[PDB]
Ligand binder design. Structure first.
Ligand SMILES: CO[C@H]1[C@H](O)[C@H](O)[C@H](C)O[C@@H]1[Se]C
Ligand SMILES: CO[C@H]1[C@H](O)[C@H](O)[C@H](C)O[C@@H]1[Se]C
Ligand SMILES: CO[C@H]1[C@H](O)[C@H](O)[C@H](C)O[C@@H]1[Se]C
Ligand SMILES: CO[C@H]1[C@H](O)[C@H](O)[C@H](C)O[C@@H]1[Se]C
Ligand SMILES: CO[C@H]1[C@H](O)[C@H](O)[C@H](C)O[C@@H]1[Se]C
Ligand SMILES: CO[C@H]1[C@H](O)[C@H](O)[C@H](C)O[C@@H]1[Se]C
Ligand SMILES: CO[C@H]1[C@H](O)[C@H](O)[C@H](C)O[C@@H]1[Se]C
Ligand SMILES: CO[C@H]1[C@H](O)[C@H](O)[C@H](C)O[C@@H]1[Se]C
Ligand SMILES: CO[C@H]1[C@H](O)[C@H](O)[C@H](C)O[C@@H]1[Se]C
Ligand SMILES: CO[C@H]1[C@H](O)[C@H](O)[C@H](C)O[C@@H]1[Se]C
Ligand SMILES: CO[C@H]1[C@H](O)[C@H](O)[C@H](C)O[C@@H]1[Se]C
Ligand SMILES: CO[C@H]1[C@H](O)[C@H](O)[C@H](C)O[C@@H]1[Se]C
Ligand SMILES: CO[C@H]1[C@H](O)[C@H](O)[C@H](C)O[C@@H]1[Se]C
Ligand SMILES: CO[C@H]1[C@H](O)[C@H](O)[C@H](C)O[C@@H]1[Se]C
Ligand SMILES: CO[C@H]1[C@H](O)[C@H](O)[C@H](C)O[C@@H]1[Se]C
Ligand SMILES: CO[C@H]1[C@H](O)[C@H](O)[C@H](C)O[C@@H]1[Se]C
Ligand SMILES: CO[C@H]1[C@H](O)[C@H](O)[C@H](C)O[C@@H]1[Se]C
Ligand SMILES: CO[C@H]1[C@H](O)[C@H](O)[C@H](C)O[C@@H]1[Se]C
Ligand SMILES: CO[C@H]1[C@H](O)[C@H](O)[C@H](C)O[C@@H]1[Se]C
Ligand SMILES: CO[C@H]1[C@H](O)[C@H](O)[C@H](C)O[C@@H]1[Se]C
Ligand SMILES: CO[C@H]1[C@H](O)[C@H](O)[C@H](C)O[C@@H]1[Se]C
Ligand SMILES: [Mg+2]
Ligand SMILES: [Mg+2]
Ligand SMILES: [Mg+2]
Ligand SMILES: [Mg+2]
Lengths: 223, 226, 226, 226
């Protein structure tokens, strides 16, 4: 099931059990302390989406679309994005307000390359896994680095938010707030997990965190 | 070549050099200690197959078909609903099994609804930390999973014949045939197996390259490269 | 058994076979080179404890209690505000320490506000790449962190007595007691430790299975399995 | 020291102990089997440089400059548009090359638009699983990539001279100079290299610490620590 963790967040990302970040409705930024009794520290800045990777990589975008990378507070990286996901230093993707899709090049002076397609959310994993959903709710998995010249393969179902920590840990929520996890069977690809969430973050190590419409925060209790 | 390790085991699984478990003919459970002078510690419980992952995840099944996950606390094991005969854990997120009728199952991550059936028929399976999955059927035919890579037939047949298989990562795949001959994957599907000297009935191939096996008389071996 | 490695060190930390660091009695800092013929290179600075992670992260504290993180450039170290006496780095995201009054701290990832106090009292701590954390208190009592797993008491006591502890991953946990006796975790909380021949005063257990130690006379050892 | 391994190779790359590939003077391709008694299996195709990652990713270039990625199925290789002379694969997401005019390229993850030029001029490059990238230029000057860390000049020069370099992770960086002398990085940019006994013309340094090399007469060696 799910365990409630005190606090309020509107978007959340989990790269690993030790790297979990979110933003609240007001755009305040928080990182998970590892202490469930005192679970958040506020990190200076303002963001509306955030992507936290297994290796400690953290990227975010603000309401205007400005893009930032955490420097271990924030360095702006040129461009404009509306949603962002970071699975690792080398696998960072986002989408802009118009739905265009970009992947980070690793060159801060020329930081994005556009990837053909249209998406409204995206999840990028440490292992290179990339999944997305479009405005209508259609679901895609990236194949453009695997020889597919149409880049994306549609996977049945409908989701509004998605997160991929690894090939084997992919979760999303539909517009109704129903929660799904990928089965690993493209012909029968989702299994419903009880609960209601509006955003979700799935880590490479299996950790899964989510927030519901009211801002309540949950960690999946797999044991 | 192989280094002989003291003790007696019937099935074995290796996820990493620090997470290697086995079961003996009496169904006792043992974990490798890291010291070849005192290699095994008995973990309470009874199992007939076991899967141990690099991330620490350990799953097992017993003679009745009951399914267990190790909980790393003083309760030791939790029973997960269902019935399985063989099991393999590549990681927390990549756990597969085969039931007594040869049906194939993948763990869903929901203990309340824990398995989805994956099409096919197998007799042994090996799952890895990177999502890699290989299986063998009762006639010895060998398959690698493709159902998460857009293949509507779920599995691709790889030439050869094996009776047990293990695949802790895409790059470390090993099996044995019914005659106890040992093979490792070349990574070339058109020339897929290299014979390795020795004799084993079960094998465990870790994500980190460790390889452990057991032979028909209970003898235990670890692979030595240097 | 242990292989003796030349040189002299007082404390040691191993994150992986390629990231092993120590300090000597003079507070000089050394990094393992990967060649047992010329095993140490002195890194400029002065420290009394050090934590080295598999991901390359290295943290240290000096005799004054000052806290440093290695920056992997010609500046070498950056001072992080606060005071600590012992430190362990499992990864960039999992760094813990204990101060001179036994209070426990976890790194927040914000150098401007770097520590949160975790309830408890300890004298040594070992943090891993998977989030695993073990500690010991001054009476030798042993604890494993549970405060990120819903436990309002933050730690579970594990039977036994140790004075130094290291835990680079859930599956590779080692310690020494005040008499210099060496123990490794069995993974069974009801039968938790296996004695290992040898004698050490500090130990470092890597994510990849590497294990290094130092003895009371400064002697340095690496664990050999094969 | 080095262990000699049978066979003959001209260039080599090691991503992990289980993913090591090379090419010989005839441009034949070989993969390491894991058994030093029968160490190589020829993989069909022709290449002049190769990069093999810990995650299984393998890229290569041929004498014409054509670029290939291994597809782990019976087709073996897929050609990727462009021309390169040297290549290194740290992981699926971190692949770099140098073309015959010394221009530097990073893989974009889009086979239809596969390369972005990174400013600079190099003659060899080594990329790691953690994003680490090192290069050398034709005069032997050594650089480490900083262009993803806010540096508008993209590279920092590290003292010394090398002709081939490999960097499977931040903590395992090795090279050779034009005189075939072997060096490993100390992690101290002000005292950056340790000389290692032996003689090699190419080297591959894995994410897991494995190190392989080849010498001018085709001789193949693996580094042994214990
Ligand atoms: C993460 O939850 C936040 C919440 O969003 C509020 O900002 C509140 C004032 O602070 C809590 Se953290 C105690
Ligand atoms: C990440 O937070 C940003 C914020 O969104 C504003 O752009 C502000 C002007 O700069 C801060 Se960076 C401290
Ligand atoms: C990622 O930022 C994008 C931005 O969203 C615009 O599409 C702009 C036309 O292109 C930049 Se990338 C130069
Ligand atoms: C991922 O982008 C999708 C897009 O959202 C549309 O569904 C379009 C019809 O197909 C593309 Se896939 C090139
Ligand atoms: C993930 O897609 C879901 C979809 O959102 C609907 O809830 C539908 C009723 O079930 C599908 Se899963 C067959
Ligand atoms: C994660 O789903 C939550 C849901 O959002 C509601 O808060 C409900 C009251 O509790 C469930 Se937890 C089964
Ligand atoms: C692992 O080998 C075991 C063996 O299976 C027997 O249980 C025997 C009683 O003890 C040996 Se060593 C623990
Ligand atoms: C793993 O061992 C199992 C055992 O096989 C029995 O099913 C017993 C009922 O439960 C133990 Se675990 C309490
Ligand atoms: C994995 O367990 C299977 C079991 O073997 C049976 O096929 C049963 C009909 O379905 C269950 Se799925 C809980
Ligand atoms: C893996 O399952 C195999 C099965 O063993 C049979 O060979 C059957 C003819 O093919 C299925 Se693949 C759908
Ligand atoms: C792995 O398959 C083996 C098979 O089991 C037989 O030993 C056969 C003689 O050789 C094949 Se490898 C061509
Ligand atoms: C690591 O051992 C050191 C030792 O601590 C002394 O600094 C000595 C001067 O040199 C030996 Se070897 C570098
Ligand atoms: C790690 O070494 C430290 C040292 O202990 C001193 O505190 C000195 C003030 O700073 C050096 Se790093 C400049
Ligand atoms: C980690 O440093 C601690 C320090 O030891 C003191 O307890 C001080 C009162 O609080 C600081 Se937290 C910056
Ligand atoms: C880890 O801290 C321990 C402490 O050392 C004491 O044993 C105390 C009685 O228990 C606390 Se656990 C809240
Ligand atoms: C790790 O704990 C040790 C302890 O330090 C003593 O050596 C005691 C005699 O044995 C216990 Se292990 C039962
Ligand atoms: C890897 O070494 C090879 C060598 O390059 C030659 O192709 C030779 C014909 O066979 C040796 Se061993 C496969
Ligand atoms: C990797 O080998 C290549 C080879 O070099 C040739 O370019 C040929 C045209 O293609 C083979 Se792969 C079909
Ligand atoms: C990597 O290939 C390069 C190539 O070497 C040339 O510089 C060409 C002008 O640009 C291509 Se980028 C497809
Ligand atoms: C890596 O490229 C180097 C290049 O080799 C030259 O040394 C040039 C003077 O500096 C560039 Se760094 C912009
Ligand atoms: C790696 O750089 C080497 C260089 O190649 C020369 O061997 C020189 C004599 O020594 C430097 Se290391 C100071
Ligand atoms: Mg997201
Ligand atoms: Mg098995
Ligand atoms: Mg320590
Ligand atoms: Mg190379």
């Amino acid at each position: 099931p799910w365990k409630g963790i005190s606090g309020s967040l509107s978007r959340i990302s989990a790269g690993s059990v030790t790297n979990v970040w979110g933003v609240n409705a007001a755009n305040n930024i928080y990182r998970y302390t590892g202490d469930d009794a005192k679970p958040w520290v506020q990190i200076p800045g303002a963001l509306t989406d955030i992507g936290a990777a297994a290796d400690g990589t953290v990227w975010g975008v603000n309401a205007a679309g400005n893009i930032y990378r955490y420097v271990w507070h924030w360095t702006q990286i040129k461009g404009a994005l509306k949603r962002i996901s970071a699975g690792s230093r080398t696998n960072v993707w986002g989408v802009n307000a118009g739905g265009a899709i970009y992947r980070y090049t690793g060159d801060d002076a020329n930081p994005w390359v556009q990837i053909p397609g249209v998406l409204s959310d995206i999840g990028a994993g440490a292992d290179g896994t990339v999944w997305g959903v479009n405005a209508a709710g259609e679901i895609y998995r990236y194949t453009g680095d695997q020889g597919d010249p149409n880049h994306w393969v549609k996977i049945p179902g409908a989701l509004s938010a998605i997160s991929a920590g690894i090939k084997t840990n992919v979760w999303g929520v539909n517009s109704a707030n129903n929660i799904y996890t990928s089965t690993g069977d493209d012909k029968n690809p989702w299994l419903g997990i009880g609960g209601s969430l509006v955003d979700i973050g799935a880590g490479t190590d299996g950790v899964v965190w989510g927030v519901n419409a009211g801002g309540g925060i949950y960690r999946w209790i797999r044991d």
